[PDB]
Amino acid sequence: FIVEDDESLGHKELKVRKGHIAKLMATEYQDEYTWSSLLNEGLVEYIDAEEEESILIAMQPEDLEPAAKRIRATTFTHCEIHPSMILGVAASIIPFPDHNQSPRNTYQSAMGKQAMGVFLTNYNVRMDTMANILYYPQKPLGTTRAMEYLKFRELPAGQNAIVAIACYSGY
Amino acid sequence: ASRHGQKGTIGITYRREDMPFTAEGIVPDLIINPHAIPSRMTVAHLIECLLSKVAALSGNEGDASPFTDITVEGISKLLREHGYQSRGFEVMYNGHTGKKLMAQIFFGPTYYQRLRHMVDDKIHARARGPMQVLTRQPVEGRSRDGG
């Protein structure tokens, strides 16, 4: 997101606005803004790996924007879109990944590619070497926003089961 | 395995009548040992279990969403007013004898997936099989009935 400096509302603000985002939601539910149509008037910017040596980024769109839960500069030029989009495809499936250890994330991101579920829908047509389809593939009760874009809710990985963290004597 | 690097396998199986069972009769699908919790440091697994339980009760499917502002305190309040214990614990009875267990236990739904490394492709044995040509030794290959 690009952040203009001088606002007639005083302090500092990012240029995109509620009217624009309403127009976006209307375009979505039409089922004629695009991403490109949002580009062509200076609302977002593509930034390579180097201009970060020339710019300044805000986490939230509120973090310094007005002048028992969690512990959380006035020259911002950009604010990032959403901090959860520093992740990758596999790691966007781990629920609450900010609430555990990083090597555990790395293991899970390795193992998830070995999971089985569906993989496509024309699988009744495609001859293939080895295929693995399970019976009753359920979307997960917990979820995050990204796996909506990953179409993962449409093609789930496994089933969800009732667990119990006990030591029932043996095994 | 879970979504947190808790890979593991099935030890043995039980039916319901000797699976442990709670007061409403929700007999669990599967039980894993508590010692996989502290040394693995896998807090988010627990948080997921709690949130998933309250999501299933409310109907509203849950939300993981990494750098948001959802806290376990809020989850706890919501689950308490749905009418269960504020930390997801549960009174639960030894399905052998019906007696109460002493310590209450954790309980809830959680998302798993089934991995491809199945035992039927890894069991292998050989006594006096086929035999290599260049070195006159037992051949390779689990599929090729090797040693």
């Binding site: - | 849950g62 939300d63 806290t71 809020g74």
Partner: peptide
């Protein structure tokens, strides 16, 4: 303070439906 634990869209769908 409401802390937003789940999802919702269609309230804002009709919100712009009468804001238009």
């Amino acid at each position: 303070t409401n802390a937003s634990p789940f999802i919702k869209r269609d309230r804002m769908r009709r919100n712009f439906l009468r804001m238009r």
